[PDB]
């Protein structure tokens, strides 16, 4: 009887959605969803809400179910199209385009579109049919030019010169020459491929770590955090929760600088691998587009190789386990079983390491659906199992954009950390790192702020049907 009521609702998320706060926009959708669930609208807003939170699972949801009630809705098509293109669905999301480029023949941009992703499709499936390195020379052929006046790699070993020596040119734009590059590449391969799935550091009574959670080519903030938080040493280690590529547009200099900094201090410098640092997120957000345009699509080969080498969770004094992204979906799981990961490879679609670089935390008790389309959230029970069946106190994750930086959540034993401050110079957000100290394993949060960049929009690189899609 209150469909006056339910459109209340529709400018009280339609709104916030304005702000912003999609956090509030979507609670306030789901509402007016709740009153009047027939609504096309209610859905197809309450997708792109999701699409900008990037829980593409739910927002493939609503774009499904508004398109049902409602086969005119061409703005649910469109928002469903995205919604596959995030989850890397090709054709799905071509059907979809198809079916607008003909109910609006006379529709520019629709059949951009259609074309667009159609190049995709065929692509993406065109390749299919042994080591990359085996093959390129390196240290042998591979020359450089006297005429480059950057850093060069001292007899291919990594200084704490030649690393402060990249970042300024990295501050400056300016590319590392390939020789270098592909030997740091090389180097950090030799050096991941020899660690276990489940690295376990041991911080003495006093010295503390350093946590930071996603950086996604934020460059720029990257180093805010080194000056802020001193440059990573064996005094002073650090420790990267994944993805540092994809969607920010600087992601070759932040990767190159990180790996650099694995190679000059192996065992104070760690990273562990995200969700992004995979092949299938990096041909749609960016990565595998910036290697290409920066170096050869060959260059990006031996990413992804590395990538794989990279480590899937590490504990600190077996009290505290942090891994990119979750818990698991399935109830036995205990530190030997991620021990015991053949990590180097994509991910499954489902299981342990795809929990682990998936998983959300969750307030209400028990697993469900991921909002994401992939692996599942938990509840504050199963984070409890979890840390008491392996005698964890807590665990420290990131995966998420948050507010202020990070979260405490499951009474104090889920804990988010986010490093990438105003995440896609969209959500103006705080960001964060952990000091971890030996004596009181308390995670001790830090804030920190926006900070400068040169120009080049967020995902300047990969297919515009992305950029077009994030804003
Ligand atoms: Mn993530
Ligand atoms: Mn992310």
Redesign the pocket.
């Known amino acids: 009887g209150a469909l006056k009521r339910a459109e209340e609702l529709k400018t009280q998320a339609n709104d916030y959605f304005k702000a912003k706060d999609y956090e509030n926009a979507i609670k306030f959708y789901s509402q007016a969803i709740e009153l009047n669930p027939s609504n096309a609208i209610y859905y197809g807003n309450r997708s792109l809400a999701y699409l900008r939170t ?1 829980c593409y699972g739910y927002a493939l949801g609503d774009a499904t179910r508004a398109i049902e009630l409602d086969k005119k809705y061409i703005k649910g098509y469109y928002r469903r199209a995205a919604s596959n293109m995030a989850l890397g669905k090709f054709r799905a999301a071509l059907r979809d385009y198809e079916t607008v480029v003909k109910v609006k023949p006379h529709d520019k941009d629709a059949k951009m579109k259609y074309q667009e992703c159609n190049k995709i499709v065929k692509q993406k499936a065109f390749e299919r049919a042994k080591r990359s390195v085996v093959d390129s020379l390196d240290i042998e052929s591979m020359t450089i030019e006297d005429e480059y006046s950057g850093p060069k790699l001292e007899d291919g070993k990594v200084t704490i010169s030649f690393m402060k020596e990249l970042m300024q040119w990295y501050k400056d734009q300016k590319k590392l020459h390939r020789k270098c590059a592909y030997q740091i590449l090389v180097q950090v391969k030799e050096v991941l491929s020899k660690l276990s799935t489940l690295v376990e550091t041991t911080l003495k009574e006093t010295e503390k770590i350093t946590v930071c959670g ?1 950086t996604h080519g934020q460059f720029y903030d990257l180093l805010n955090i080194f000056e802020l938080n001193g440059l990573p040493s064996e005094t002073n280690p650090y420790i990267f929760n ?2 540092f590529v994809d969607r920010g547009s600087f992601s070759v200099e932040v990767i190159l600088t990180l790996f650099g900094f694995k190679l000059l201090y192996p065992d104070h410098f760690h990273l562990l691998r ?3 640092e995979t092949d299938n997120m990096n041909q749609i957000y960016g990565f595998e587009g910036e290697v290409k345009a920066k170096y050869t699509a060959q260059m990006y080969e031996l990413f992804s190789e590395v990538f794989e080498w990279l480590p899937l969770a590490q504990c600190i004094n077996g009290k505290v386990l942090i891994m ?2 979750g818990l698991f979906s399935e109830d036995g799981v205990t530190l030997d079983d991620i021990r015991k990961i053949e990590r180097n490879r994509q991910p499954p679609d489902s299981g342990p390491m795809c929990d682990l ?2 998983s959300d935390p969750q307030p209400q008790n028990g697993r469900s659906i991921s909002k994401r389309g992939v692996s599942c959230q938990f509840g504050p029970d199963v984070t409890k199992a979890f840390l008491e069946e392996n005698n964890l106190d807590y665990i420290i994750r ?3 954009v948050k507010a202020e930086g990070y979260e405490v959540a499951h009474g104090g034993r889920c804990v988010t950390v986010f490093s990438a401050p105003n995440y896609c110079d969209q959500m103006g957000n705080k960001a964060s790192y952990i000091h971890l100290q030996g004596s009181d394993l308390r995670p001790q949060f830090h804030q920190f702020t926006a900070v400068p960049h040169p120009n080049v929009k967020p995902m300047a690189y990969a297919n515009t049907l992305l950029q077009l899609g994030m804003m």
């Open positions: 990037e996603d994944g993805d995200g969700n992004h990119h992204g670089l998936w990131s995966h998420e």
